[PDB]
Design a protein around this ligand. Structure first.
Ligand code: AGS
Lengths: 55, 61
């Protein structure tokens, strides 16, 4: 129902196919997802050496 | 095509409310090849950008 464009949409831009096919660090991805399903803490932060992929 | 006389007048100087500062945008934009600027700085003063936050280091060339 919300406008949703106060920041920027992220799903629909990859639905356009602009950011398809990312080589993945699968142990890193699941580190997010397991932090995402917790009852209490629900906020991961990708702290990293600035050169690497964060976005 | 964009040109900058001194990038120090963009990041070293500038209010947040007066325009682009170190805390404004174009930081996560200049990952992408969307915007094409051409700057001009001097070396020993360009070392302030490295010691400022060490984040423009891999966005400019
Ligand atoms: N795993 C990856 N696969 C492909 N390209 C990658 C990957 N990680 C980073 N990149 C490239 O890195 C560039 C963007 O820089 P990134 O470091 O990814 O951005 P970032 O992680 O947010 O670092 P900051 O925060 O912008 S300084 C783009 O050219 C991406 O294609």
């Amino acid at each position: 129902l919300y406008i949703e464009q106060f920041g920027s949409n992220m799903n629909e831009k990859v639905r356009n196919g602009k950011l398809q096919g990312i080589y993945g660090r699968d142990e890193e991805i699941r580190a997010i997802i397991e932090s995402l399903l917790r009852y209490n803490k629900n906020s991961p932060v990708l702290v990293g050496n600035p050169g690497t992929g964060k976005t | 095509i964009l040109f900058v006389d001194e990038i120090h007048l963009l990041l070293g100087a500038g209010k947040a409310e007066g325009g682009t500062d170190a805390a404004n945008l174009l930081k996560p934009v200049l990952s992408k090849g969307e915007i094409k600027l051409i700057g001009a700085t001097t070396i020993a003063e360009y070392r302030k950008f490295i010691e400022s936050c060490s984040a423009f280091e891999r966005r400019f060339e």
